Amino acid sequence: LYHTVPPAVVGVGGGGVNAGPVASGAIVGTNGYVITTLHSVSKLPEISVQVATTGGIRRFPAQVVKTIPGHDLALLKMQTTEKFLHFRMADVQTVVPGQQVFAFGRNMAGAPLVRQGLVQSADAPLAVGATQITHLLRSDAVYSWEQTGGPLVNAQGDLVGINIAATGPTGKVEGFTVPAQVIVSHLQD
């Protein structure tokens, strides 16, 4: 699993040469579609997506194609003629409390992050700035802010959702997750 999922896990950040990922994202289409969290890229002047290859990190400029503000998601398209391995939206599955899930990300250096955990809730609300997002998943697989925007998968490696790391009142990290059907159903082309 830790072999076949990471290639579709990207880093996302600004366009500076010396800039690295500020969040993660998931490649969801051959021609360079990335889903990531909206609050991570909306204030960025330029967006660059960082992709792992056998020869090291490759960077591609990206633009926003569609925003899903109600669920803090953004859909990017990389500007490239290259083709990518991706999550197959057909294979998108749901999860239930108790189920085991895996949250992937890339750090500020482009290295892969994975953490395992259980689904603790399948209906939690979250406040990202002014938006009240509802019906979120909740899981302890999300321990780090660098995991925000990256994918949650099940044990078979199907895309299950997109992760949001949030702040507790005590400052403890709590894992949240936008269910992956929010992707298919707020999308068309």
Residue numbers in the entry: 34 to 222
Which passages does the manuscript contain on this structure?
Here, we characterize a protein called MamO that helps to initiate the formation of a magnetic mineral called magnetite in cells of the magnetotactic bacterium Magentospirillum magneticum AMB-1. Two genes in the MAI, mamE and mamO, are homologous to the HtrA proteases, a ubiquitous family of trypsin-like enzymes that functions using His-Asp-Ser catalytic triads. It appears to have lost the ability to perform serine protease activity and instead performs two noncatalytic functions: direct metal binding to promote magnetite nucleation and activation of MamE’s proteolytic activity.
To explore this possibility further, we determined the crystal structure of the protease domain. Although glycine is highly conserved at position 193 in the trypsin family and is critical for catalysis, MamO contains a glutamate (E223) at this position. While refining the MamO structure, we observed a peptide bound near the predicted peptide-binding groove. We suspect its source is the flexible N-terminal region from a neighboring MamO in the crystal that is not built into the model.
